[PDB]
Design a protein around this ligand. Structure first.
Ligand code: 9Y7
Ligand code: 9Y7
Ligand code: 9Y7
Ligand code: 9Y7
Ligand code: 9Y7
Ligand code: 9Y7
Lengths: 331, 329, 331, 331
């Protein structure tokens, strides 16, 4: 008789798979911010971490494990071998190079496409029925790449896209109006990057159109220069990188927001990277952000946002830029 | 008429009500910050450090996640006026021991840092609770207590709250039980010299020491003493592997902040002025189980200790005082 | 040498005042649904319950106390004496009269005046600086009654108003569209219940106005009968009363959401009943729902919603009717 | 060309089973307290309610649905037909008759057998892999009844047992000591109600045995009368029933805590009713509360608490009494 069997009588001898497992690939600052945010939101019964830097991977895993008393995720594992990711409902990809001070996310394409050619087939091997949530940059291009490599249906390949750009826009609109961002509504669509599109025509508080109240909203003639709010959204990651070297907390919270809608099947609307072929006359297989209904099958529906002619032209410009990159990739 | 004034009619033009300050925006301070934010413990969070670009960037990165949070004001600055009217001020700033440096010299460097920080915290929040997280935490909790002039109930060290959480994690892994249902206390000094109180280790009120009398001894064939060895060594291991520890101490500290801010009167093993107990006759802070709430430490539990356990706490007190009596304030 | 003193060393005895205390007046089904919802949202460090039926009051308190292990509100108190309510940040009133067969609305409101002439001065005595949240019906008139008796400034007297009517609207819109109500936006304003006003222009998903897409929205010429959504907002409450005898759960959750914005100083926008003289075309001291910014000082600001001629006229007709009753009340 | 189709482009027809579904059977006060507590803890992605009182059932469902905006459980359904319960992970049974004037315990139990013969086969048909959590009283005997009728293995038939008795004990110990109940530890085992057994040896704060500190603990000689804490557990419930008519909130919260451990696979330890044959000299098919490890598959393990001879004899006497009733039941 050991202490454990003196103390505990066992009824059930058998291993069951987890019901709500999430994997995070990449344990850099973005991956770990996604991991802690998901842990504190009680979204998973198992969290797996994967990376190729084996000591940092084990250290991050242990540091999370040591906080288990304070969490409700009873199993946290890690390994360089993708077998640790088996049976995941949601696999969040954050691995890859990140942009340095002043560098475009679009400058990361060659490196991160090559990294994805290794990661995605291994994720798909061990969790053939997962949803993929791509966070690595440039996220629109890499969501297309993950879709092409995985062979998944496009509903199950979701880019974090402009969920964060829209959150930043709502934060800045809240600061100008003195209203919590939850009650400030406004969308930034298109590329998660320099060509994103602020949809002035949809901005509102309590269903009151700000453009109807202020017809010059967003234009160069605007005495209040609201276009500067979108400029600040575009420049946000650059400013934060210049100041602290990288960004992590806001994208971790944005990714956890997306994970909550997926894992809890909420059917909330988020601007995420998806194929927009068939909207706005676009015929190319281009991925960028539009508002999507998110739940347990990933993206089940696209919202058809009415755009002004100027907003639509900007969105088509974003799509042209991204498709010019995406069309040249070779698999 | 601005857009704002067309949209919004103003009824009227306050002091922070449930504010927390984190001093130091290294990995520990920011893990404390994110854990406090995702537990909705504060209506205002202030960050302070002296590295101004890093500080502003950390503040901005948190602010950009505001849509996903329920803490409507996040502020920062090198000037301590940003900390005014904090209920709880969490100190994580400090130097790390460098190659070759004596323990006394590292502590003295952190005394010198605290001589800048603590008076400024006290100026702007004279009625706060101070929660010291910086290492070596038991000595730096004494340092903060001396400099602040606060009563001992309002100066708390994070102490062995995390050591105990690690113990309960490791015990749960051995037994196949969640750590919430695995009870055991690690007391005394944080880190190397901590004391596992084997008599208190239990599941469902069943004493493991009574079931297994070799528990905690070297002759134990099951080597349960290895659980405490790993409480000590797993910290070193994380530091070797990833460079530092952050997430578990953030969650531990948010645990403590919850009991204080919500006045819960939960018991935690935190570092408190222990002069009077266990034959200890010096001004030293060690971890014992403390009742935590809105006035800080209001009460503590008098754990019955074996002869050997008591002697370990007294030896620790002697060691800490040996360093403290040499410090230059 | 008591067990307690053997076990516990006391460091100090200092008189504690709660920092985040809430009182609920009335422990009928509505009051208790508000209480359980506030407890399970961790909004208060002390909950006080008050009512005039002493046995029921004590029983409810005891039943909640027995669940303390599962909560993070360490003190729950109750009594018929208002001294238990001292130093509340927020006092929620759910008590008041039941209308009798044959009794005029004026006479019913006068009985509530007489009941509130007891309740409200006792609340004010013990928590002079609280916000008052009136949930008792008829809520818009009773919010006026509480404001008059309390002598509080407008910002600190709030009626729950159309907060639940709007939540019902968003639920019903989400059911039609297959979208979570969080992502379905729409506002019901004016009087709570029968005479409320659905603001069709503000009904939207992702900033897309349903009225713009579908100009017959809200009219009798609408083949999809979207007007029926607001008919159901009005009628679904009668239906719940017919089926189970009363409503409780949804108003409890509604009220807890208002309490969250107030207690956490969020400055979220809610349609609650506020003193609307000088705004929205009205000239009398009446309370109606409009979107209000809620936080630690109660209503600090409100949103000026652009209304159609018909909507404006309905709010004005409501104001005339409320003032017609209020001017005959005896305080 | 419907408004929904103008607004929303559908990608995905298919609809999956809910993945984290809970059913509550019985929509009396206990069942609805369980329902609201499970909803406010975000434990389920679908909640089903079943009862045979069809109007009350529909009313309760609608009242919860109207609070959807404030919840993260996107589907709430109800019906008399058990097809609404399909694919539940957890089925909570609160239905049953109360003991009437002049009624023997045997005949009350038999009336509840007759009720469970309708319920349990229908629950099993539609969720053959669920855990059954029996809350109906007398709970230890009705857990046996559910087990016999369902044919389920003992790990998937759980009685709420002494979980709330123990929570009450910890509340009362916290009141005496001035410590939150979370930091007061102590176990009430055996039969729920009058015959339950306070295990004095395990009562502790911070691992400090109160029995070792205060050897008279739990004896008649105790000057502090700690025995009366257990008497109060046995009677505070009768007291709540006397004062408000029934108990509900504390049950609802304690059942939601059980459900959290099961749905999140936490492997926390709870004192619940489980098949105890083979322990403490018991040789009959009887259910009593012992500390059990709860998770995805129900009860996976039991803690073998060390009992005094007196304590063990009390459990054996309970077992003899329960079997004396059970052996006379007609299935
Ligand atoms: N031979 S091996 O198996 O050791 C191996 C295979 C693949 C890679 C590619 C690779 C990965 C990577 C691969 C898989 C993961 F699961 C993962 F999390 C990350 N990150 N990364 C870089 N990261 C940065 C940064 O600044 O973070 C700059 S380059 C990179 O170049 C490397 C080694
Ligand atoms: N003249 S000044 O205003 O620029 C100024 C005043 C005080 C100090 C002291 C000081 C602080 C410090 C001071 C206040 C804070 F709020 C705070 F968070 C941290 N950190 N630190 C060091 N930290 C490390 C590490 O390894 O992290 C190594 S030295 C240090 O030497 C410096 C400058
Ligand atoms: N009783 S005492 O106050 O004198 C005292 C406490 C702790 C230690 C050792 C010690 C130190 C440390 C490092 C360099 C020094 F110069 C120094 F004085 C102390 N950091 N640290 C950490 N613990 C963690 C964790 O995650 O648990 C991360 S770092 C730890 O356990 C010694 C003495
Ligand atoms: N603008 S006003 O203040 O004049 C006004 C407010 C409300 C009503 C009708 C009314 C009443 C009511 C009850 C007792 C009375 F004596 C009384 F006059 C009215 N209860 N109630 C409810 N609403 C719900 C729900 O769940 O929404 C459950 S009951 C409702 O909609 C009329 C006028
Ligand atoms: N023909 S029918 O469909 O209308 C129908 C079928 C089965 C039953 C059995 C049944 C139920 C019952 C059945 C299923 C549930 F889901 C449920 F929640 C409760 N309660 N109950 C009684 N309850 C009491 C009390 O004193 O409460 C006294 S008899 C009883 O006799 C009835 C009707
Ligand atoms: N071991 S056993 O299964 O035979 C058994 C269980 C329970 C009782 C006493 C008992 C009964 C009860 C007893 C006999 C009946 F015929 C019956 F219908 C109900 N209800 N109840 C309640 N407890 C609460 C609370 O909130 O704790 C509210 S009611 C309670 O404590 C005796 C034996």
């Amino acid at each position: 008789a050991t202490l454990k069997d003196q103390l505990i009588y066992n009824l059930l001898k058998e291993e069951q798979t987890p019901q709500n497992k999430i994997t995070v690939v990449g344990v850099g600052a973005v991956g770990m911010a996604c991991a802690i945010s998901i842990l504190m939101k009680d979204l998973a019964d198992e969290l797996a971490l994967v990376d190729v830097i084996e000591d940092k991977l084990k250290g991050e895993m242990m540091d999370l494990q040591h906080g288990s008393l304070f969490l409700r995720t009873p199993k946290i594992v890690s390994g360089k071998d993708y077998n640790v990711t088996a049976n995941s409902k949601l696999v969040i990809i954050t691995a890859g190079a990140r942009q340095q001070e002043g560098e475009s996310r679009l400058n990361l394409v060659q490196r991160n496409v090559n990294i994805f050619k290794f990661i995605i087939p291994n994720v798909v091997k061990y969790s053939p029925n997962c949803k993929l949530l791509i966070v690595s940059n440039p996220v629109d291009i890499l969501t297309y790449v993950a879709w092409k490599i995985s062979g998944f249906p496009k509903n199950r390949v979701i880019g974090s896209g402009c969920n964060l750009d829209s959150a930043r826009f709502r934060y800045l609109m809240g600061e100008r109006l003195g209203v919590h961002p939850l009650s400030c509504h406004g969308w930034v669509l298109g590329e998660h990057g320099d060509s994103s599109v602020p949809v002035w025509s949809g901005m509102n508080v309590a269903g009151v159109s700000l453009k109807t109240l202020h017809p010059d909203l967003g234009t160069d003639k605007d005495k209040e220069q609201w276009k500067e709010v979108h400029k600040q959204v575009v420049e946000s990651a650059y400013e934060v990188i210049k100041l602290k070297g990288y960004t992590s907390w806001a994208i971790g919270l944005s990714v956890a927001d997306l994970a909550e809608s997926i894992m809890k099947n909420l059917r909330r609307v988020h601007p995420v990277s998806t194929m927009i072929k068939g909207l706005y006359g676009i015929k190319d297989d281009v991925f960028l952000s539009v508002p999507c209904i998110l739940g347990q099958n990933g993206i089940s529906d696209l919202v058809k946002v009415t755009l002004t002619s100027e907003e639509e032209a900007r969105l088509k410009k974003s799509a042209d830029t991204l498709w010019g990159i995406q069309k040249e990739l070779q698999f």
